[PDB]
Amino acid sequence: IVEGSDAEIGMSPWQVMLFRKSPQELLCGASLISDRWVLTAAHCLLYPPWDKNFTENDLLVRIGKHSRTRYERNIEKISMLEKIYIHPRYNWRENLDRDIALMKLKKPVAFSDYIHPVCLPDRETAASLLQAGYKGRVTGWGNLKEGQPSVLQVVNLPIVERPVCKDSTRIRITDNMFCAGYKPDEGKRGDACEGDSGGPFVMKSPFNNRWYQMGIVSWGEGCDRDGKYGFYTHVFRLKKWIQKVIDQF
């Protein structure tokens, strides 16, 4: 996260760290949506241009964390994966369209002060909240600059009008994406960066005071460049796929 702050303890209890076994390294962020299911970006697991193709046994999910590198004894839980599910029409060839993957944990994690699931939006939560100008919140342990934090970072960013998003890039934008960030003139900064991939963009509903995950950190061109924006997987647009996977498996 570029131009963010240290998270408070328990501020994002759904935040998950994707962790490579060997070399032991942070792969990506992710989010806890039930006691057994983790949501992330498909490109965290599968990206052939970079020869990235992780399987279940390549991976550990760490939940309840605050410190990036410490093993947080009696606070974090580390889980093994049972099954990874990538969207069948994830487009790694062109524009990361449908950048979404589910991971089923080998056993259910127990919730605590530090570990708690985020909600997934319904149609009318999406309609109400996913509006240009409304701010969401992104969290992660990724790079501070386009260097790495000791502690979970947090930044709040406004949704950006769809035409502004399109005019900022040569990449073809789809309806399964939205972009967030301050305009150059707005005089506030901040962005996700490398290592934040797969993490949650969340908003707090003013109607029921719950946190909803609206986006997944997907892609950007640089980190916190002026006139550039962060692009996020549109979680509600792909919730039908989510529901399908979860109650099939």
Binding site: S5, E8, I9, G10, M11, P13, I33, F111, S112, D113, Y114, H116, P117, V118, C119, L120, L129, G133, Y134, K135, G136, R137, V154, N156, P158, M203, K204, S205, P206, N209, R210, W211, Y212
Partner: peptide, 26 residues
């Protein structure tokens, strides 16, 4: 069913330091 309500904040009726910026934008 308990989703999106944080043990150390909403459940205790405590606010985190910047969540107001979110709600002031809506």
């Amino acid at each position: 069913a308990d989703c999106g309500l944080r043990p150390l904040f909403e459940k205790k009726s405590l606010e985190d330091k910047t969540e107001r910026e979110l709600l002031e934008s809506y």
